[PDB]
């Protein structure tokens, strides 16, 4: 038996390595960054017809200009999502201005490795958050998509896919995405890629798409909107 802060022989924290393996069992969420806004789409994955699909919130609102798509242990992501919401609200109170997308991802990545048994307090994490996040927003630099995992490493990507079928989805984005692709073109690409890697026939109640454009705010496609692009 080992402690939570134990390094392996290859130089990797065991706990973090197992937390990254827990994100391969979560739903897939494809994010595509363009010049006219960011687009996020997640696979809801309902396991029962009695289960209400509107209670599954894989994509949340961090602020008016920032969205968030998560994968892996959804319950652990509720603590990271609240930190991000309080961080962007705190920034506004102190500087009277919106926080940048990279700044929000940085503040959420700081808690990633904040865990341990010894030399800790009552309200301290005992393990790492087994969840990955896809931050998409619009600041002074325009549309920006960020990715944060259990290790606490946040990087920027033009197109990212996290979840169970990430490997298959990531490759399908590498040859269908270009720098001049429109936001409407990105929404179709994501939907097409999502439909391929999914088990259940994609429909209006299965997935959940969200978009954040320069002049607009965070927006979640409804049933009607989703149906339009589905056909």
């Amino acid at each position: 038996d080992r402690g939570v802060n134990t390094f392996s022989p290859e130089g990797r924290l065991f706990q973090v390595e197992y937390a990254i393996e827990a994100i391969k069992l979560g739903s897939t969420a494809i994010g595509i960054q363009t010049s006219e806004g960011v687009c996020l789409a997640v696979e809801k994955r309902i396991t029962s017809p009695l289960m209400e699909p509107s209670s599954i919130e894989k994509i949340v609102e961090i602020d008016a200009h920032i969205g968030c798509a998560m994968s892996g242990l959804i319950a652990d992501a509720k603590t990271l999502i609240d930190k991000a919401r309080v961080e962007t609200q705190n920034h506004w109170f102190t500087y009277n201005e919106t926080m940048t997308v990279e700044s929000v991802t940085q503040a959420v990545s700081n808690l990633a490795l904040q865990f341990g048994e010894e030399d800790a307090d009552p309200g301290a994490m005992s393990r790492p958050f087994g969840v990955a996040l896809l931050f998409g927003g619009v600041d002074e630099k325009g549309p920006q998509l960020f990715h944060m995992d259990p290790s606490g490493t946040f990087v920027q990507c033009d197109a990212r896919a996290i979840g169970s079928a990430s490997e298959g989805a990531q490759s399908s984005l590498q040859e269908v995405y270009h720098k001049s692709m429109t936001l409407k073109e990105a929404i179709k690409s994501s939907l097409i890629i999502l439909k391929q890697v999914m088990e259940e026939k994609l429909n209006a109640t299965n997935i959940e798409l969200a978009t954040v454009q320069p002049g607009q705010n965070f927006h979640m496609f409804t049933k009607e909107e989703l149906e339009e692009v589905i056909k």
Binding site: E61, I62, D63, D82, R85, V86, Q89, N90, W92, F93
Partner: protein
């Protein structure tokens, strides 16, 4: 300071003067005593400029965070209750603020008065500030629940005008707001000097 608010048939009317003083000296005459919490929430300020500004800004940050978690706009009763509990912690410490929360939630228009002392009451017509006594006179006199929008704007403007004429700590311009079901709108911002030429 002179701020008034009253809810008639067509929503809530909010009016205030724009003058800050540093004793006998008139610090400024373009101060905004009405702060916007959000599109359906208004907040007036009276008393300590730094006190009302910092605490109403703190309430606005609390209302935005509340709407992200519950995925819905906060009510006028909850907004005032939030602010009331905030200032209660520092009760009898020097805080000086007399705000009025107005908005249009589920139960129609709502107008609450919240001071630093501890008060938190709901009503149909309030008036905070050093010139509030003068504003009450004109307000009540011309107040009617079936007042027309144009007639309500006149009443609110005339009420702040007479209060700035009698009170030395009230002056500047007269900012008028109108809260509706679709959200509050900035009616006007007439200057007191121009109002004096029209009422004479």
């Amino acid at each position: 300071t002179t701020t008034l608010a009253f809810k008639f048939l067509h929503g809530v009317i909010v009016a205030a003067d724009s003058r800050a003083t540093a004793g006998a000296y008139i610090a400024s005459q373009t101060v905004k005593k009405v702060i916007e919490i959000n599109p359906y929430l208004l907040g007036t300020m009276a008393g300590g400029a730094a006190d009302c500004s910092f605490w109403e800004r703190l309430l606005a940050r609390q209302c935005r965070i509340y709407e992200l978690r519950n995925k819905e706009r906060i009510s006028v009763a909850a907004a005032s209750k939030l602010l009331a509990n905030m200032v209660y912690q520092y009760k009898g410490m020097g805080l000086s603020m007399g705000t009025m929360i107005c908005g249009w939630d589920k139960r129609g228009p709502g107008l609450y008065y919240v001071d630093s002392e501890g008060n938190r009451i709901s009503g149909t017509a309030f008036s905070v500030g050093s010139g509030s006594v003068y504003a009450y006179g004109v307000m009540d006199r011309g107040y009617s629940y079936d007042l027309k929008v144009e007639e309500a704007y006149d009443l609110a403007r005339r009420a702040i005008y007479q209060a700035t004429y009698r009170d030395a700590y009230s002056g500047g311009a007269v900012n008028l707001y109108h809260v509706r079901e679709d959200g509050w709108i900035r009616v006007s911002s007439d200057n007191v000097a121009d109002l004096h030429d029209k009422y004479s």
